Amino acid sequence: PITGLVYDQRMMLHHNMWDSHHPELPQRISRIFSRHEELRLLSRCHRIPARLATEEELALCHSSKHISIIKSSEHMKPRDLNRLGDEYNSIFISNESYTCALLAAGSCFNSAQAILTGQVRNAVAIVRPPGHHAEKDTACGFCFFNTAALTARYAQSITRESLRVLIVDWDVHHGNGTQHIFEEDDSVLYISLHRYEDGAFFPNSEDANYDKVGLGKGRGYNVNIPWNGGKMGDPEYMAAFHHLVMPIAREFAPELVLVSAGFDAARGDPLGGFQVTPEGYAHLTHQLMSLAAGRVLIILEGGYNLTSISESMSMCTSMLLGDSPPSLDHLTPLKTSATVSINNVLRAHAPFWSSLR
Numbered sequence: 001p002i003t004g005l006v007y008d009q010r011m012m013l014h015h016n017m018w019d020s021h022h023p024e025l026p027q028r029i030s031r032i033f034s035r036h037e038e039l040r041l042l043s044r045c046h047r048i049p050a051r052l053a054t055e056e057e058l059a060l061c062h063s064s065k066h067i068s069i070i071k072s073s074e075h076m077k078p079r080d081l082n083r084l085g086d087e088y089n090s091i092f093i094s095n096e097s098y099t100c101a102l103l104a105a106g107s108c109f110n111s112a113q114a115i116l117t118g119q120v121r122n123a124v125a126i127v128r129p130p131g132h133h134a135e136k137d138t139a140c141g142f143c144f145f146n147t148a149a150l151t152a153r154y155a156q157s158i159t160r161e162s163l164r165v166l167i168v169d170w171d172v173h174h175g176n177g178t179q180h181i182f183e184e185d186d187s188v189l190y191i192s193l194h195r196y197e198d199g200a201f202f203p204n205s206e207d208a209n210y211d212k213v214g215l216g217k218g219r220g221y222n223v224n225i226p227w228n229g230g231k232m233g234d235p236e237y238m239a240a241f242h243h244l245v246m247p248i249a250r251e252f253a254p255e256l257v258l259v260s261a262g263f264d265a266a267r268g269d270p271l272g273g274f275q276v277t278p279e280g281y282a283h284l285t286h287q288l289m290s291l292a293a294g295r296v297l298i299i300l301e302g303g304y305n306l307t308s309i310s311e312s313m314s315m316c317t318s319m320l321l322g323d324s325p326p327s328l329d330h331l332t333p334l335k336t337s338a339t340v341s342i343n344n345v346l347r348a349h350a351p352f353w354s355s356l357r
């Protein structure tokens with residue numbers, strides 16, 4: 001049982017020319033990698049080679065216009081980069097951004113390929129810029145191309161088109177791009193937990209509410225677990241996994257699990273306002289490992305406290321390597337509003353998943 005790891009320092013080259021202290025820092029990935037070395041986890045993993053995605057691979061999920069506009073930024077002058085970035089919601093661009101986004105995606109393709117060909121059982125991808133806010137036709141929220149969505153489609157392209165992929169998105173934000181890309185698809189089950197606040201939390205759309213269950217053949221294959229009015233943490237996430245994520249995932253019976261693993265719900269994050277602990281993330285990882293015969297790929301999304309993300313992701317890797325789940329801190333009673341959220345999702349998805357009845 002081998003665990004793969006992909007990391008390339010050159011993904012640090014994407015940077016904010018106006019604000020060197022912008023939270024989506026180059027050192028997010030080097031810090032996570034360093035913590036893996038410090039804990040002696042890196043040598044326990046097989047290093048998967050990084051590579052650039054191709055334009056044809058980007059077209060699995062993105063329009064030709066979007067690909068061409070982002071590709072063009074590699075040769076843009078600063079004024080062009082600033083103006084282009086300001087056309088999107090929450091994007092900064094440098095001359096290295098396009099190449100870094102390609103590297104994040106291609107690293108994830110190689111990791112999925114290593115899993116699907118039986119070279120490794122599971123894997124972790126320490127990548128930036130993130131992906132889950134990127135839409136077919138636009139960039140958004142620090143994301144240029146939807147790495148996780150592209151990896152699901154890439155996996156299908158090297159296996160069979162109907163390969164069942166589960167994407168679990170535990171970044172504190174709703175993965176609007178991932179939801180939209182797969183909204184009419186039953187081959188990719190999208191499950192997101194996210195701070196919602198009745199639509200007031202970024203990305204500020206009611207598309208993230210529990211009543212969005214999918215469209216067309218995808219009805220039932222989009223599961224939004226939105227949190228309102230409360231500093232959620234381990235008790236709420238464990239309860240959501242027990243009552244919703246795991247029962248639905250088991251019924252779906254995925255052949256590959258991708259984790260959109262943002263660590264911005266972590267205790268200490270400057271943006272998320274939540275308190276999921278590193279041991280909490282470890283328990284979530286260990287639960288997902290019971291699916292798809294253990295074929296799990298953990299993909300870095302957001303997460304902005306360098307210490308928190310480094311501890312949290314490195315513990316997920318420890319779980320993938322087979323280590324025993326660490327003890328959790330005392331779990332307070334579920335916040336009353338988290339009970340309401342879980343029951344609302346249960347009511348919305350009981351029609352589609354017999355395991356919830």
Ligand SMILES: O=C(NO)c1ccc(CN(Cc2cccnc2)S(=O)(=O)c2ccsc2)cc1
Nearest residue numbers: 090141142171173201202262264271301302303
């Ligand atoms: O991690 C992410 N996605 O997965 C992610 C994180 C941050 C943003 C942009 N921001 C808005 C925001 C507000 C409240 C909660 N979250 C996000 S912002 O940086 O704070 C900002 C501060 C002064 S202007 C803009 C976009 C995406």
Ligand SMILES: [K+]
Nearest residue numbers: 182185188221
């Ligand atoms: K779907």
Ligand SMILES: [Zn+2]
Nearest residue numbers: 171173264302
């Ligand atoms: Zn996020």
